[model samples]
Target: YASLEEQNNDALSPAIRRLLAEHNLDASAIKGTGVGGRLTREDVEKHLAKA
Candidate 1:
């Protein structure tokens, strides 16, 4: 699972941050299915769409 420590080491783009907010989610809450703990927009979209 993705973690806060992993997120802390990452520098997120403003667009990514905005997208998270749009989904009412925190950056750390993102499930990093992307390589190297990275969260894709598609990832967030799917996560939001699912439970």
Candidate 2:
């Protein structure tokens, strides 16, 4: 809410971030279905599958 970095820190996990980095995906662009709408690997996979 205060800063971009803090928002991102809350948005994704280390594993999810690394997975996105490996696939060159933008976490902000995907819709998450996890708790608090947090990013999940499955969300990334679904995005990759759809796009």
Candidate 3:
């Protein structure tokens, strides 16, 4: 199956996208911590550590 990583390509910001790609992470499930549930690079950084 194709990874859901492709699903959120445009839904995320470039910084967040690059970070997730580098870590080979599927960001489809990430709970955005920014305003209106937006995801941030720092959020991904901590997520990598948490997961």
Candidate 4:
């Protein structure tokens, strides 16, 4: 899990944050499915669906 500071400075955009929050995720708990452990909007949506 990434620290608060990491998430703040992460390359992710507000769209990603909204998606994660909508799915009741705390961004940090999501294991990035993107390259280099980066999280993508699609990844969050997929996880939400699975969960």
Best by lDDT: 2
Candidate 1 per-residue lDDT, tens place, 1-51, comes to 286555435645778857776767886755777777666776676566654
Q: TM-score per candidate, in order?
A: 0.42, 0.46, 0.43, 0.37
In terms of TM-score, the best-performing candidate is: 2
Note each model's CA RMSD in angstroms.
Answer: 12.2, 10.4, 11.6, 10.9
- Candidate 4 stretches greater than 4 Å from native: 1-14
Model 1: worst 10 consecutive residues (lDDT sum)? 3-12
How would you encode candidate 2's per-residue C-alpha lDDT over 1-51 as one tens digit per residue?
Answer: 687666533544577657877888777888778887766667767667665
Give residue 25's error in model 4 in angstroms.
1.5
lDDT (C-alpha) at residue 29 in model 3: 62
Model 4, 1-51: lDDT tens digits are 376556444455677656765656787766677777666766556555554
Go through the candidates in order and give each one's C-alpha lDDT. Answer: 0.67, 0.69, 0.66, 0.63
Error of 2 at 41 (Å): 2.3
Quick one: ranking by lDDT, best first?
2, 1, 3, 4
Off by over 4 Å in 1: 1-13, 27-30, 48-51
lDDT score of residue 35 within candidate 2: 88
